[PDB]
Amino acid sequence: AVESVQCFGRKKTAVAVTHCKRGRGLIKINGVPIELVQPEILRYKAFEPILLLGRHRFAGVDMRIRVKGGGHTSQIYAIRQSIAKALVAFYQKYVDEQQKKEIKDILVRYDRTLLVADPRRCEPKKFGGRGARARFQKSYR
């Protein structure tokens, strides 16, 4: 029986799904190593789940991540959230609950968005203005 889990991260319209299973500890997104993710500035956000838990805890799981929708920042945030959730679920289901709780606490203490999706969404625009709140310029004379 295959030992794998599939957890998804969300940010705006971006949806990333991480396939975590027993392996030698490779992390790739769309077949590309996680070290080459773009933009280069957001590599820190991408690697945050790994820099807090260290590379060793990922040494026994192969992670394959597929992302879709959203934009360049939303996709990165969704990817990191999916990685965190997938690792937590894998530790919960195939590793001692004590270690799963430890890693979950470590992840949450740094940033709660690593496991809980941000619910913010675009506000629909209303007639009488260009934006959701912004109204057309008013003139009196």
């Binding site: 077949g31 590309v32 190593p33 080459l36």
Partner: protein
């Protein structure tokens, strides 16, 4: 080590250099006079722009094997300035894409996909993989 494991920029440079060294490409006479699209204001700065574009197109075909001339026109398009009017998306030159595809086919790097467009050949896969491996 394959192309997916190397930076796209470095691989593009290396493969453009390899294509130029190959000598099988037949640049059209108008490469030095045409822009890359109606949306551009000037011709490409780099004299080796044709080889770079060919390398990028070959990499794109390697990643996806169903692209046509219109798809490449969209891929290399972008915003077009209209002076005092707002900008809108514009397609790129189709003749350049058609010529590059024909030249790449002549080298056995790509062929015609049965479903339409172009597909990477086994020889193309081998060549791109070797070029990526030698980048290190």
């Amino acid at each position: 080590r394959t192309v997916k494991d190397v930076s796209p920029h470095e691989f593009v440079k290396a493969y453009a250099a390899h294509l130029k060294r190959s000598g099988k490409m037949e640049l059209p006479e108008w490469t030095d006079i045409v822009k890359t699209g109606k949306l551009k204001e000037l011709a490409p700065y780099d004299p080796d722009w044709y080889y770079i574009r060919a390398a990028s197109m070959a990499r794109k075909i390697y990643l996806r094997g169903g692209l046509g001339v219109g798809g490449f026109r969209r891929i290399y398009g972008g915003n077009q300035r209209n002076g005092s009017r707002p900008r809108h998306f514009c397609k790129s030159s189709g003749s350049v894409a058609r010529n590059i595809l024909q030249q790449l086919q002549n080298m056995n790097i790509v062929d015609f996909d049965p479903k339409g467009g172009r597909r990477i050949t086994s020889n193309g896969q081998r060549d791109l993989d070797q070029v990526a491996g030698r980048i290190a």
